[PDB]
Ligand binder design. Structure first.
Ligand SMILES: C[S@@+](CC[C@H](N)C(=O)[O-])C[C@H]1O[C@@H](n2cnc3c(N)ncnc32)[C@H](O)[C@@H]1O
Length: 249
């Protein structure tokens, strides 16, 4: 009788990702290329109070993490502040520092301490909890290596926060483009560094992006093959939601 433990299953929260064979970089570029070619109708079919929608997403992710106590928290790329606001509701505003580039308007509690800075600039420091929600999708006319390099360059800024002597006990790190060699290598290094970490895909996320999150739950390894499975499955779902199945029936 597994009892209450059943309630911490993945259920409707995240995709099931078992590892599979393949090159994730090549599959990711292939489905991105097909997404850039999609017609207006195809793309639209496939693409579908609180300070933002980030509030509920972080609530899902923290529930997966078994509702940990957060303590001193840095929210990197806080934007409008949905994540920071959820941390405020959970534990008060005193432990949060929001970091973002504003000029996005802050839509969360103004008692929350804010630093108007480029997260690539700040020297890291020691926190109980690290949140990172940076990441940008590029437009369909951009060379693919542009988007990959830009988001790799953001994750490299997170790398200094993860690799410090006392790493964050809790972390929630958005991975905009998880199939680059640098993202996969960074996640493996963070798993070795912390002894923790699982890369998840939220259920209900838009098929029009490849966002995953790295969470400080019990270790789940073979990240490369799980990204491979994620990208292949994402590609098939994009196929099906973009057609327009002809009957034929
Ligand atoms: C998608 S928002 C995150 C939303 C937020 N977590 C919420 O719940 O509302 C990411 C924000 O990071 C900011 N950003 C992008 N690059 C940045 C950088 N290099 N340094 C600091 N902020 C950055 C953008 O302005 C954007 O508003």
């Amino acid at each position: 009788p597994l009892g209450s433990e059943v309630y911490k299953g993945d259920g409707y929260k995240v995709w099931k990702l078992e590892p599979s064979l393949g090159d994730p970089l090549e599959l990711g570029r292939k489905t991105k290329t097909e997404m850039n070619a999609m017609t207006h109708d195809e793309f639209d079919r496939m693409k579908y109070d609180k300070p933002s929608k980030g509030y509920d997403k972080l609530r899902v992710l923290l529930d997966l993490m078994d509702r940990p106590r957060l303590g001193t928290t840095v929210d990197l790329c806080a934007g409008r502040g949905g994540w920071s606001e959820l941390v405020k509701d959970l534990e008060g505003p005193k432990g949060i520092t929001a970091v973002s580039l504003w000029e996005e308007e802050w839509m969360a509690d103004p008692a929350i301490h804010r630093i108007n800075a480029n997260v690539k600039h700040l020297r890291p420091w020691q926190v109980d909890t690290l949140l990172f929600d940076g990441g940008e999708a590029f437009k369909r006319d951009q060379n693919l290596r542009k988007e990959e390099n830009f988001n790799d360059s953001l994750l490299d800024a997170v790398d200094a926060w993860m690799m410090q002597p006392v790493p964050p006990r809790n972390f929630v790190i958005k991975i905009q483009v998880p199939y680059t060699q640098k993202a996969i290598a960074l996640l493996e290094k963070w798993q070795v560094k912390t002894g923790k970490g699982r890369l998840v895909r939220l259920a209900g996320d838009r098929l029009s992006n490849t966002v995953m999150y790295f969470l400080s739950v019990r270790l789940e390894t073979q990240i490369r093959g799980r990204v491979t499975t994620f990208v292949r499955e994402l590609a098939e779902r994009r196929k099906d939601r973009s057609l327009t199945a002809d009957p034929s029936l």
